[PDB]
């Protein structure tokens, strides 16, 4: 019977690297035919596949993790390697490796990254529809205390976002005064009083409480009929 | 009255280095380009910020390039720069350089940006990654009922597709390959087949020891993908 043994993982401080062994008894790695696999799966997530590794010494990896993750093999110890380096909380995940359709698994080894959480921002609505002269409403809900630390930005095709309001409310000079913002919580909202031709675009709410800066999905505000 | 202006984007193969040059007239950089921001735009999509200058000399990056991007400047030139190493597919997008204000706390907001310069990464002849859409996210249903979940590749995968389950705290197990064949082990209820570009995993008279989540998994291609998973619930646990 075949088993695969991990071994590796832990907390690991952001910028560190881990090297994650995956030890094979009941078959031979240097077979002809045989590859090991390593897949991640975040915590709540799915799988994703990162490498692998055939008995010619071969190697595919993920984009995810080019230029960091290295697949290697000891075939005196039987044993298949996953080097990662750079590490960020968006590395953390169980690690498996499976032998190879992925028939036999390792048990998993739980790499945990870190030393806060990003902050989300939920944009709504993803879109709408309006004619000239109508108000409209857009709003950015932070997923934890931002204080007033929120600006809004336009954007139209083919051309760099345009600063509207920062700091929540303050406009910024040369824009019109028909743009407003305000906050309640961390629950944001730009309102255009009266829309006009020039302000049919997309509109970005962005966070600067803390690095990494985020931003919204993006309203898109459309001409009713289309 | 200021400009700036970005070169340096272009045409890159799997794995390939760049380096972006943001250049700034009509005011001088602050030392060490302190504020310059990077935000980049793939196409069709938001913004997601990359990478700031800022203050004591800790500059600040987005997780999915740390390692791979370095910011820099030489104010000399009143240039910024995004050196890019590492880069793939998902780094294809239009690159913007902005400056943030500086003087206060209260106040990091982006006026000024560059025009954009756009990063085109191919994939080498590998072609676009195959999507496996999976479908329902969930289900809930009783002992005994029959239980049928599909899959949809994004390409033709022709046959080369596997069915797994995988319960909490446990690794996936291999449940079906190549479609259709049922692996040694696997309880006579579960099936697997293809029409065309969509694939079926059907349980028969559904057992307790069969709420679990399952997935599927092309090979057709490398990156090999699975689906988001299918959670088998028991109908009335909400």
């Known amino acids: 019977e075949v088993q695969l043994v991990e071994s ?3 907390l690991v401080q952001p910028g560190g690297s881990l090297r994650l062994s995956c030890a094979a008894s009941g078959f031979s790695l240097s077979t002809s035919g045989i590859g090991v696999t390593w897949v991640r799966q975040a915590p709540g997530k799915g799988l994703e596949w990162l490498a692998t590794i055939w008995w010619d010494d071969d190697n595919r990896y993920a984009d995810s993790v080019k230029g960091r993750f290295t697949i290697s093999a000891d075939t005196s110890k039987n044993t298949a390697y996953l080097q990662m380096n750079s590490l960020t909380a968006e590395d953390t995940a169980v690690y498996y490796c499976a032998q190879s359709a992925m028939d036999h698994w390792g048990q998993g080894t739980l790499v945990t990254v870190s030393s806060g959480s990003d902050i989300q921002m939920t944009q709504s609505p993803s879109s709408l529809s309006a004619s000239v002269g109508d108000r409209v ?3 950015c809900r932070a997923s934890q205390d931002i204080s007033s630390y929120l ?10 976002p345009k600063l509207l309001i920062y700091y929540t409310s303050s406009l910024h000079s040369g824009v019109p ?7 309640s919580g961390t629950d944001f909202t730009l309102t255009i009083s009266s829309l006009q031709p020039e302000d049919f675009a997309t509109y970005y709410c962005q966070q600067y409480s803390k690095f990494p800066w985020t931003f919204g999905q993006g ?3 459309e001409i009713k009929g289309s």
């Open 8 to 10: 590796g993982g832990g």
């Open 137 to 139: 409403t857009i709003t």
């Open 151 to 160: 600006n809004w930005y336009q954007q139209k095709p083919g051309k760099a």
């Open 177 to 183: 005064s028909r743009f407003s913002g305000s906050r």
């Open 219 to 221: 309203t898109k505000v």
